[PDB]
């Protein structure tokens, strides 16, 4: 009873309307690069690394095109993903305007000091030194989160 357990009729209809719109040759598959525009169509604003994750979730890692059953699985897993790692990635991505998977040291510092359980200048100094991982000025937050996932 495919996807009757996971998605609703109106969800499957919405996903169809969004997906099929990029099916050029009408074989039921879109170039994976369209996946950004397919989610923007749906009122999501996912990061590059976010879409690479959705693709990995279904073992289409760089598979050139993407199936509709594949696209249904992605959506239906990401709608119900309460994993802690995912919460942390999602929180950082609210401060990544463009979605390139980075955030300026200056911008990260500004957020950590002025929002929330506000960090001290000594505390936040130590965060930039650890998160500015690979060169200077730009924070790869996905790797920053990778670093503090283990141990």
């Amino acid at each position: 009873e495919f996807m009757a357990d996971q998605l609703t009729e109106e969800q499957i209809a919405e996903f169809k309307e969004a997906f099929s719109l990029f099916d050029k040759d009408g074989d039921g598959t879109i170039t994976t690069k369209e996946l950004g525009t397919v989610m923007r169509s749906l009122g999501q604003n996912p990061t590059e690394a976010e879409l690479q994750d959705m693709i990995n979730e279904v073992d289409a890692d760089g598979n050139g095109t993407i199936d509709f059953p594949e696209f249904l699985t992605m959506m239906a897993r990401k709608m119900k993903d309460t994993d802690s790692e995912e919460e942390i990635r999602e929180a950082f991505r609210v401060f990544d305007k463009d979605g390139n998977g980075y955030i300026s040291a200056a911008e990260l510092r500004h957020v950590m000091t002025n929002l929330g359980e506000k960090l001290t200048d000594e505390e936040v100094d130590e965060m930039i030194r650890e998160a500015d991982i690979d060169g200077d000025g730009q924070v790869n937050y996905e790797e920053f989160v990778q670093m503090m996932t283990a141990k």
Partner: peptide, 22 residues
């Protein structure tokens, strides 16, 4: 906003807990 304060606060809570584990 309250939304952005909560994202920022989630990251703070998580970092602090990681640091406190050393």
């Amino acid at each position: 906003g309250p939304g952005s304060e909560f994202a920022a606060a989630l990251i703070q809570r998580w970092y602090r807990r990681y640091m406190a584990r050393l």
